[PDB]
Amino acid sequence: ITGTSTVGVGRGVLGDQKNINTTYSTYYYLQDNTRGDGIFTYDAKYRTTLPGSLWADADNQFFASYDAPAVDAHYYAGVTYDYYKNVHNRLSYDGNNAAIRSSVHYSQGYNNAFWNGSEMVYGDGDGQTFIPLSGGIDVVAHELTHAVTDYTAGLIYQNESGAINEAISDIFGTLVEFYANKNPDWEIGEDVYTPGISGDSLRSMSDPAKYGDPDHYSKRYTGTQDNGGVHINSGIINKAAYLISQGGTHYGVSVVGIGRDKLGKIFYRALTQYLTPTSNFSQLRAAAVQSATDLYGSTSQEVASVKQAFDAVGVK
Numbered sequence: 276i277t278g279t280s281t282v283g284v285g286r287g288v289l290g291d292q293k294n295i296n297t298t299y300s301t302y303y304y305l306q307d308n309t310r311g312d313g314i315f316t317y318d319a320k321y322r323t324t325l326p327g328s329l330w331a332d333a334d335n336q337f338f339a340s341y342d343a344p345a346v347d348a349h350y351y352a353g354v355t356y357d358y359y360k361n362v363h364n365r366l367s368y369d370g371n372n373a374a375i376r377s378s379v380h381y382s383q384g385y386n387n388a389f390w391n392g393s394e395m396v397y398g399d400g401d402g403q404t405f406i407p408l409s410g411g412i413d414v415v416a417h418e419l420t421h422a423v424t425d426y427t428a429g430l431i432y433q434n435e436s437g438a439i440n441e442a443i444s445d446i447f448g449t450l451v452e453f454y455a456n457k458n459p460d461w462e463i464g465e466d467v468y469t470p471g472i473s474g475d476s477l478r479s480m481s482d483p484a485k486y487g488d489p490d491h492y493s494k495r496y497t498g499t500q501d502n503g504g505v506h507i508n509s510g511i512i513n514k515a516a517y518l519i520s521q522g523g524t525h526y527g528v529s530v531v532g533i534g535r536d537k538l539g540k541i542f543y544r545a546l547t548q549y550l551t552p553t554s555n556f557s558q559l560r561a562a563a564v565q566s567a568t569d570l571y572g573s574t575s576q577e578v579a580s581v582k583q584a585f586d587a588v589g590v591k
């Protein structure tokens with residue numbers, strides 16, 4: 276809606292207070308006109324038809340329990356936009372300030388989130404296994420980073436190729452979580468996952484096998500569940516990353532970390548330059564070898580560490 280940019284206040288999923296850019300035209304809208312061609316947030320009203328209705332509000336205060344997941348979807352699409360602009364000098368997922376649309380209250384008891392080739396989607400979960408999934412900034416940015424990915428390298432959603440893609444969302448997932456900086460970790464989804472069990476998560480970058488996910492190529496899933504185990508074999512790539520950023524001996528291979536900012540650099544470059552639709556694990560390394568090699572010279576510690584991490588994950 277054409278209207279007046281203002282700033283509202285509301286309560287997030289974890290019940291934390293934060294401001295959010297709204298749009299005033301009769302109603303206040305969840306429409307942020309300050310980041311590219313707009314961040315709009317929608318109400319799917321528990322249905323499964325999208326996007327739903329551009330959320331509207333009569334006071335610009337969002338402290339209702341129902342507004343919780345919107346607030347946080349709007350707010351964290353923002354931060355993620357900023358992340359990619361500020362850190363990677365990139366304008367929205369398409370690189371040309373496309374609108375980031377998001378819908379909340381998707382279906383009833385929907386314990387998942389997604390990017391549908393055109394918008395993120397979040398369900399309120401079931402209040403056992405999940406709470407409103409947008410509650411988690413890694414949930415949010417992972418998904419938005421599916422868009423980035425579906426406009427850049429276009430990594431197919433299946434087998435080894437799908438696993439990089441999901442891994443890509445898990446790596447920048449953590450890199451926006453660390454951007455935003457509040458109790459940031461290398462786990463996936465700890466803030467919206469199992470309310471009433473404390474300290475677990477969907478996946479572990481530090482230690483994939485913690486939750487049964489693979490941490491070495493050898494130990495990789497060859498079946499067809501989960502579309503070739505895209506969510507399963509992403510750990511191999513994830514521990515490489517964790518390893519590349521943080522260092523550590525893994526299966527007897529030692530790794531000198533190089534930090535996060537160089538993590539993202541090396542991985543963004545690679546996404547945006549060298550990875551194609553069908554890039555398996557062996558060509559990611561090639562991508563990350565060559566990306567660092569560019570961004571840091573062919574004998575840097577950087578180039579070595581990436582070799583370290585992949586060697587560590589068994590990826591030849």
Ligand SMILES: [Ca+2]
Nearest residue numbers: 332333334336
């Ligand atoms: Ca209100």
Ligand SMILES: [Ca+2]
Nearest residue numbers: 458459460465
């Ligand atoms: Ca946390």
Ligand SMILES: [Ca+2]
Nearest residue numbers: 413460462464
């Ligand atoms: Ca996390």
Ligand SMILES: [Ca+2]
Nearest residue numbers: 468469472473
């Ligand atoms: Ca939990």
Ligand SMILES: [Ca+2]
Nearest residue numbers: 487488506507
């Ligand atoms: Ca699993």
